[PDB]
Subunit: 353 residues, 4 copies
């Protein structure tokens, strides 16, 4: 068969177009209105370079590309015009990277679907927005009273009666969601819900082993992580830290080679001095990590020229061990920034049509 896309002749076999017998070109009654019985061809008055990837979809047997010149709002119309189907439309989706939104879990009630739209979806309604302005205020007061409790003018109980205001309110915002979810096993895997409970598990022990009395106080600071729910930027931070496992491990490892190698070199170049502040290898560990990171503290300083040549080569190599696996992390942060701020806003406006 011969197809004439506004002047460009594409000519393929008939059994290639019969592989997909539900599309425009596969159905002999839908493409029959585009025939041209004077030249024995089908004439479409469409975009020229967009058909080079439509014909390759039939030839390869199912793959969908996108040519570089044609934009996404143009190529999303040719799949809609040639009637390739939603199977081929969704295969165009993840090829561009934009994954479709997952279906929310419906609990199938009217009391339960209302309270699900009341708290977990704060953007929808009025009292949905009413909790969100106080779910920032309840968190910020709890972190700052945890700071104000540690202030030593009071340490070195009205400070108990102000913190129970925030914690039963923390318990208020959890007991309204303990019974209001579609599922319960999926409740125990979502890390948004996984730390919230840990905030109460450390307080319920307090009303009813010194090392244990301190450990708990450390978990009380976890309440900072509750800000991740209603803050859009932290998920971009949360996904970048969670997609960069094997690159973050190389960041702390590449300096650990530089810690041991340079603490030994500053030691043996200053072992022949009684006034040397570096007593041993764990003594000069803090010097080796404060010079490679280019902070500097000045507690332990080399004095001789043999020890002033290793730290100068330590600070130079200290940049060249920490700035090497960094720029893949700032690119992953740019990916989750560009697939949340203008990723789906430009995709789903012309991907769902």
């Amino acid at each position: 068969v011969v197809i004439n896309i506004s002047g460009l002749r594409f000519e393929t076999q008939l059994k290639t177009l019969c592989q997909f017998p539900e599309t425009l070109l596969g159905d002999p009654k839908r493409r029959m209105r585009y025939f041209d019985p004077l030249r024995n061809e089908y004439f479409f008055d469409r975009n020229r370079p967009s058909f080079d990837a439509i014909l390759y979809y039939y030839q390869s047997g199912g793959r969908i590309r996108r040519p570089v010149n044609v934009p996404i709002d143009i190529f999303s119309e040719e799949i809609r015009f040639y009637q390739l189907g939603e199977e081929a439309m969704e295969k165009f989706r993840e090829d561009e990277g934009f994954l479709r939104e997952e279906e929310r879990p419906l609990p199938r009630r009217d009391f339960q679907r209302q309270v699900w739209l009341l708290f977990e979806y704060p953007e929808s309604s009025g009292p949905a927005r009413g909790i969100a302005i106080v779910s920032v205020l309840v968190i910020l007061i709890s972190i700052v009273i945890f700071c104000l409790e540690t202030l030593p003018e009071f340490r070195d109980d009205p400070f108990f009666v102000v913190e129970t205001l925030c914690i039963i309110w923390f318990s208020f915002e959890l007991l309204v969601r303990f019974f209001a979810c579609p599922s319960k096993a999926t409740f125990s895997r979502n890390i948004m819900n996984l730390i919230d409970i840990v905030a109460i598990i450390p307080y319920f022990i307090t009303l009813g082993s010194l090392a244990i009395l301190r450990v708990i106080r450390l978990v009380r600071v976890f309440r900072i992580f509750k800000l991740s729910r209603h803050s859009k930027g932290l998920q971009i931070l949360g996904q970048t830290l969670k997609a960069s496992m094997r690159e973050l491990g190389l960041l702390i490892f590449f300096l650990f080679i530089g810690v041991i190698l340079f603490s030994s070199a500053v030691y043996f170049a200053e072992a022949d001095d009684p006034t040397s502040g570096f007593s041993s290898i764990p003594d000069a560990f803090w010097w080796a990590v404060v010079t490679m990171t280019t902070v500097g503290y000045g507690d332990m300083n080399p004095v001789t020229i043999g020890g002033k040549i290793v730290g100068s080569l330590c600070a130079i190599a200290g940049v060249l061990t920490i700035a090497l696996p960094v720029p893949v992390i700032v690119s992953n942060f740019n990916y989750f920034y560009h697939r949340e701020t203008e990723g789906e806003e430009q995709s789903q406006y012309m991907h769902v049509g």
Copy 2:
């Protein structure tokens, strides 16, 4: 109809070309001189790949692209040759990003249009350039006498008779523009003119509540912002700070998570020491912000190994919280640098033709 662009056959319907009945291809008396009655086609001896985007303009119904291979001085001629009109020429403008220059407000006088070309447009004439060499000298002396007034050899009035020289000259450069503008409501929105007046409002109170006597002195430093008018680079800085609102907010927020999380960790790892300099959580706030930024001050130092493992993980994570939203800011600065230094100089030389 068949169009033959120097060997490449483009073939579209007649009602597609009749959508725009004022262009070259739409008018049956302007395209009639390009006919070829031996082959029944129109023959243009033009550039080949530039017509693929001209024909798509008719087919889509008004959109203008630009193919990647053809440069801007070539594609700006094909819109001029096919006579697509200024409506289609200006639709090509903002597609490339280069917005046209806005019309200046004409006050419609001869006394007023002369003084408008005298001060606000310093590049035009001689006395237009005469004020610009002294509108740098009047500003630099006022900031440095504000510095020299604060010098304590004189603090701990001939210093009044030197600062009134600059301020009535500041008032000279404002009263010549109070009455010389096209409009007055547009006068009160332009931020160039919005701070200039604030420079006098803080001085006129002085000739005619201790906290109030200090606040005013703080506004006197605002006179630095008057340098933004005649300096080309500060608008590139001013637009980059003003186009990066939601990214600058994430920069100060991502360290605020790192301030509280790391000040608690250095506290509880050093709470069991009487010689620990960290008294409390606001006490070690300054330590937490000076280590993540990699400055270091040395006023408060961890001494034990349990406290020397958190600051080493603080400085490493301190780079990975502040360098993440930075590279979008240095790209926006590159955009306003490339759309002011070679943006309009390459555009309007071939966009207005």
Copy 3:
């Protein structure tokens, strides 16, 4: 001859296709089944833009390109379909950069090929993985006892009986590979094997000139480099340091211009002060290197305004001398990261077919 690649007419001479008389198009009995005796041409129903680089392979006489639009899994099939041969397939290999894997040296035995697959190839079998979990544990204990030996609570012999456990185990892991290799001259060039022996050469002198007693202790730290064998990331670090010879030399040279030029400027601007801490040019060398690297130590500080203007211009220029040859190094690290993690996994899945 005329070749019709699904609508696109390619037309070349016959002696061009006869340059390679073993391919599809060169053999008059293999291409004869694609003939079309009504139009006098050969009709292939293949991808359109992939044949523009197949025909140029015949015309140029052997070169293989790849067009930008067609991906690698598509263009690797057209070389497989047109039967260009493995000579042309391997010429496509290094054009994409992906070099094929070299053949391992076979020692041609059954005792020797088994022990070669036992230790040097730890990913293969069970006891191949059994040594790898203890070849990390034997190394980490040896570096930390070298740290613990230097701790001065014991310095200022049961610490001999714990280090011989690691060293005969180091000798265990070398004597199993002294006699188990295909070759011996290739044994003495591989830098993985070149430092391992140096670890014993410094210990065998110890059981059987003070400067010599210290030098040896410095080589004992070399045992850190033994971690490079079973760690995947260090080869990416090792290749980036070994491919950047002339760029690393310019990094230490560009600051050496800044060391001498700025130590002289801080000297002569502070030579007229008796309280100046800078005694001479090697005295202020440590100040010049700690300011350009932005660490800061505070041992020697300028006090006057003439000396506070050079260090402010030193720290500004100190970034602009060290950050200039850095970004080619972080790009080379990205190349060896992308040719080891997804380089050969995407290449050899469709390069060897």
Copy 4:
């Protein structure tokens, strides 16, 4: 006329090809051997996409592009095959950026052209390489004796008899080039030769006003700049500093806004404290420049919370004022690195053919 580039039909007028009546297509006796009297066309068996830019050269009237897909060693052959001439070949040169090498000034003698190839061209011959190994040794000794002269164990004359060895040798390497050049006005503009003489002008005053006795000593350090002649990397540094005038000025200006604005804010937030180390605005200038650059010195520290909030906002904004005009400088350094190391080595191997 119709031109058939191996299957692609290009069809232009005859007067377009007659604009350049010396090329292949312009001469009716050179293109006559490519005619095809059965189809009435010219048949070239060349590369297909390379002719789209050859035909546009005739149509536009002289411009030469290069299409993106075709590499430089391919497109440099089509200009050689179609015989466009060296006028069109050199117009292809600077379009790719690679400027041709300038002709060296010939003094037209045999004594003078020999000594010109003896010293200024050290790569050519044996004694041309003989001076280059001692023109590094004569410079390095002169900078280090200028360092060793300033050492105070000798200050606080055999050190005169060692420095005259280097200076008459400096005079040896200048008097051999005073009389050995093609021109003398071009001698006084080349900045390589402009500082060399300044090295003697400061020594000839010494053998034959205290401020003048110190100034000279400062110029003696200029001898570092003599290393730029035989060092390949410094010209890449020298061109990057000399092509970035208006960007380097914005680097020192953007912090000068941050110096005055933040020194005033730290002053007025600490003016109500008698223990505040910041006496005045020039007193806290050194604090403001050491925090934005992230060095830190610790001489003057804020103590109150009102002064600990400005320096935390100073160090954050201090990165965002200095890292903004930096990445255009590291790109210019990459341009002069890629046009000196692989720029002309890949160009002139196929640009001069």
